[PDB]
Amino acid sequence: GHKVKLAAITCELPARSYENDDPVFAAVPDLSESWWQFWGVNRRGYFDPRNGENEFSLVVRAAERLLRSSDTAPDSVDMLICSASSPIMTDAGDVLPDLRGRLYPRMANVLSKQLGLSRALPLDSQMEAASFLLNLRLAASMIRQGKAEKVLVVCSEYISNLLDFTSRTSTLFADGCAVALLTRGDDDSCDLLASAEHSDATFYEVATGRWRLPAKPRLYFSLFSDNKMASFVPTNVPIAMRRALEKAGLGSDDIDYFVFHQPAPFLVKAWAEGIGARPEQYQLTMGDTGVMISVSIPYTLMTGLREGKIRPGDRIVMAGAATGWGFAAQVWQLGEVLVC
Amino acid sequence: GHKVKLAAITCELPARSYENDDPVFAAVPDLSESWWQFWGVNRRGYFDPRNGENEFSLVVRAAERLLRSSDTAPDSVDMLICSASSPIMTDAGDVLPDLRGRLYPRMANVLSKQLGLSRALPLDSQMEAASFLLNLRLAASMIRQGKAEKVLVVCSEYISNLLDFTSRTSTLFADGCAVALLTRGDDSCDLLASAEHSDATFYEVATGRWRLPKPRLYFSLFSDGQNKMASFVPTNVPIAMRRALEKAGLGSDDIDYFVFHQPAPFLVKAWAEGIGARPEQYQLTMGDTGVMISVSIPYTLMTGLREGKIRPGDRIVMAGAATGWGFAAQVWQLGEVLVC
Amino acid sequence: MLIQAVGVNLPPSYVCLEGPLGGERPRAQGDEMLMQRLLPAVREALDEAAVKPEEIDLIVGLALSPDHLIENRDIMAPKIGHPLQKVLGANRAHVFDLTDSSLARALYVVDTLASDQGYRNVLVVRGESSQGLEVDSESGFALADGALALLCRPTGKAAFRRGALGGDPAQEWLPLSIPLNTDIRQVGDVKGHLNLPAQPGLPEAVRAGFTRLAGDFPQLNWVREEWFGQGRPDGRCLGPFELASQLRAAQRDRLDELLLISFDPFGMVVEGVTLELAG
Amino acid sequence: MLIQAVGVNLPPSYVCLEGPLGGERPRAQGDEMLMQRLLPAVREALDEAAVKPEEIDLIVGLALSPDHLIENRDIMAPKIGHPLQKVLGANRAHVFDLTDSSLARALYVVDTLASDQGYRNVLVVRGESSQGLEVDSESGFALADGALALLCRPTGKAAFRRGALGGDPAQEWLPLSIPLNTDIRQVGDVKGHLNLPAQPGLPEAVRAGFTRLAGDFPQLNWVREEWFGQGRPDGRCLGPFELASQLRAAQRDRLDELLLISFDPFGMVVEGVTLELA
Ligand SMILES: [Cl-]
Ligand code: NA
């Protein structure tokens, strides 16, 4: 049982920010304050590939920064775990310079070569919006069992190249990247105390990506009356949190702060209220970034650390839901985290 | 042709009221304050047939009360126009005393004989939640063209016997009846203009289907985002209002008060904003009644009259949407209306 | 009301039922549904008139059938006018349904509404695919299955009459009712039952009602619905769908005006509407 | 990691492609989709191990196919693990996907996560129904179609090695890539193209990589994936699906332990995982 240290974290957002009234949304059906209130969105970024911004370039930038700042030699990284929800990747840097639009490979193989991570086992995982939690979870098990001493975790969401700016859905989602470093801890000050993950496929078909002619993947909605989940909405996230807390031998009251996925304010609140979290024990961050799929969680974690909401020695719960559907929660005892 | 007078109106609601926490909802998934606030519902009534309340008996009560109170002789009614959204009728009074649960006949053929409306042409119409407006419209055209002098209009909604009390949707809908009297005017009151249109793009989204353990609500949305209505939500109701206002040679500023169908606070607000209606120029009435399909509009009209929000000489717009989908708006100049 | 064009589509199978209210009537088979039959009737009329679906201002439906309306045979609401509007692309139309109304009555009311709204192209449709209703085995009463499409141009000039039945004045006529099936166990079970009590003088009483009503417009040729086989060649009758061949005969004979007469079995009355014909 | 059972379901139709990376491989036909083969493979494994769907703690999917996954042939996401959970009634499972991972790497990672979480029954599935990808006509490279199901019990004791390819150590092997089809006009157009350049020494370099890696566990018998037809009976090869008949041979021979060796054409490496047998 080695201790797992969350050592460092950083994010890289798009340079450009877009308001709700921005002309990018001209072909979107007219929307009111009711829509904006409900989803809690004010502004969001989109990558501009013409100014060198994409899923790969911004990760390289963030990862180089984090590695330099945390004094991590590229050679010392034992594993690299990447996620990206879009089925399409767009750039392979200096590694595969001629390759453009692609399905495969995924990021880790390519990124590890680009960064010089000469010992890193590359892995690309998918759990949509919960992928940052999955990746921490994988990293932690490896550290814990002595199979890695340093793990780099990456989530990169370039969703804007797929958004249909004639649709209302386009106003909800946005781009971003996050990178974290996990290490074998020296002392007790940082550890992953417990986690719980579960999935429920009852409503699998409700939100799918499909290849659609005008031609690219698109979001498709399917609801038919012609069964409910074992646990009803909005309890799945709270159930995951309760399981994790029980496994850690803790209660809600033992927790200092909470970090949630950020799909909508009423849903986050519902999750918080389900576990007994008070409004001052978590943040809503979708207002400034939009919904960044897997990147909302780590952006939210980073925000809380940076703003002093989450302090060294705090116990936190991180939790979220994902399409498919999937649910993940983690109970961390945090030490000092380098925000870079 | 002739001027159309809205002479009298009444409603009959169920005797029993059901709170949001009522055990009738025990098998419904737990809902929070967020849901109740969003839908604007606090309580609602359901007919109790065991104690003689149903779609017919309450209409008979209300109609007898209205005819007495308006000093209207049964033989003076030239047309009776009825709507009921449920395919199942349950009571034919003294007219067909042995007939219980039935598909046909519809209400007017029976109600006319029960009430002694011995000169009334019976008609049963269907435009779901917009049926009150359709019927006022049919009535008004008959009066205007000199083909009737007095028209009795009925909407009666017994939906609670069809609701699925394992489902969240069951918390939104409720039972009720309305009766109105229209007459040849002169000349304080008139129907200035109307507009009606329909869009079947999303026909299959909300249907009634025979379901073994009898009709049940079925939902069925399958979309890409690419197949929208020619006019996007939520502009269909505003478009109907505008078309009506234009036919009447009026603008929004010429209107004193607005009466809307009552599906949810956000949607009513969207419709109001779409046409220029300010928040204090209409009421939200779903709070103590729930959504009563065709009966929400007349109940709202009546409430506004009764509470002094709408008064003699006021110009009003009545408007709403219905499943199918259908949209209707009316511009009235109202004289004095008997609320009974 | 001016009739621009008419479309009809009847099942190929005629089925005989015995009884005083019996006859040989068209019957939809197996899992046939009303749209299959309605859509071509509608298209026949739109093609004859050269009216495009986008030019239709109003669609008004009349169909008792509690199921077998559309592809999903279990759907009963909203009513058939709405999927019709969808399949046609009738994107300027208003849609509503007049339930158990007679056709004459519907045409009168529609003429009135539509002329007053200034509409130019109005589609009135009448159909049945009645597998979901049990026939009346005691009387022999059944609905004719089929589809009739009337493409109209309103005038607001249609005259209307609602009359009593003929035969014996002292006779109390017992109406059609359609009770709900209270024992729906399987899929394919009927949803209701046709209940029209055996009344052997009823066919003739309706016909005498028709003649009385026609007497109010002695200047007009008339066309009528035939809901009963008693006294008719081979007991054959088409219900409201009988109207189609009569309306076509009328145009061929160059009539400009006519009287159209319906039987309403719910009210046990006859109803007439005066119509113009295209030409 | 202990292998409790294995299930396999391959198309009966084979297609031969010429080239130095060619061979004769199973190919899904017409409208066929992955679930049609995956579900029986999974059931086969559950039945062999006597494990019920509700006893599955984890489902981990590996499938490159960008469409032809489930009944709606145009769905690519979420990935196949999710509808698999649904059609199985695997109501206790956590589900995720490991993308372009090799099987050996996936088993190691899963062993690690799953033993750390106390899971007892873990399903790893690998499949393809590749009609949505254009084959590499120049090299003859294609993916084998079919489904493999591994029902596992984690131990956390699986050992793992990632090794270089053999042959010329200065040779820069050109990896597999799958570019997006930029000219998708019609229904049934491919969504991407398999691109593995013609490299005639590659099969032998992979074999030499296998042999070197096997030397890290010299007392273990080994099983391996066969991605190329070169040198194989009939020129036929089953890709990762070749593993099934070999694992079954091992069970027949009563082996307690073995080394499983994958080839990763994306990374151009070979990867091995040590496994226990039921
Ligand atoms: Cl790599
Ligand atoms: Na008589």
Numbering used by the authors:
A (entry chain C): 1 to 214, 221 to 232, 235 to 348
B (entry chain F): 1 to 185, 187 to 214, 222 to 348
C (entry chain E): 1 to 279
D (entry chain B): 1 to 278
Q: How do the authors describe this structure?
A:
PqsBC, a key enzyme in the biosynthesis of the quorum-sensing signal molecules HHQ and PQS and a member of the β-ketoacyl-ACP-synthase III family of condensing enzymes, has unique features of a heterodimeric subunit composition and the lack of the canonical active-site asparagine. Alternatively, it can be channeled into HHQ biosynthesis by the activity of PqsBC, which catalyzes the condensation of 2-ABA and octanoyl-CoA to form HHQ. FabH-like enzymes are usually homodimers in solution; however, the PqsBC crystal structure we report here reveals that PqsB and PqsC form a novel heterodimer. PqsC lacks the conserved asparagine, and PqsB lacks all three conserved residues of the FabH catalytic triad, raising the question of how PqsBC mediates the condensation reaction.
PqsBCC129A crystallized in space group P212121 and the structure was determined to 2 Å resolution with the final model refined to crystallographic R-factors of Rwork = 0.190 and Rfree = 0.237. The crystallographic asymmetric unit contains four copies of PqsB and four copies of PqsC. An analysis of the interfaces reveals a large ∼2,238 Å2 surface area buried by interactions formed between the PqsB and PqsC subunits as shown in Fig. 2A. The structure is thus referred to as the PqsBCC129A heterodimer. This large interface between PqsB and PqsC is observed to be almost identical in the four copies observed in the asymmetric unit (values of buried surface area are 2,277, 2,240, 2,223, and 2,212 Å2 averaged to 2,238 Å2), and the heterodimers superimpose onto each other well with an average root mean square deviation of 0.243 Å (8,182 atoms). The fold of PqsC and PqsB is closely related to the FabH enzymes and PqsD with two subdomains each composed of a four-stranded β-sheet surrounded by α-helices. Substantial differences occur in the C-terminal subdomains with PqsB having a shorter sequence (124 amino acids) with only two α-helices and PqsC (160 amino acids) having four α-helices. The active-site residues His-269 and the mutated Ala-129 (replacing Cys-129) are clearly defined in the electron density. In a noticeable difference with other members of the FabH enzyme family, an asparagine amino acid does not form a catalytic triad with His-269 and Cys-129, and in its place a valine (Val-299) is present. Pro-242 breaks the helix α5 in PqsC and directs an alternate path for the polypeptide compared with FabH/PqsD forming an irregular loop structure, termed loop A, which effectively opens up the active site cleft. The shortened PqsC helix α5, a prominent difference to PqsD and FabH, widens the entry to the catalytic site and provides an extended cavity that could accommodate a bicyclic molecule such as the reaction product HHQ.
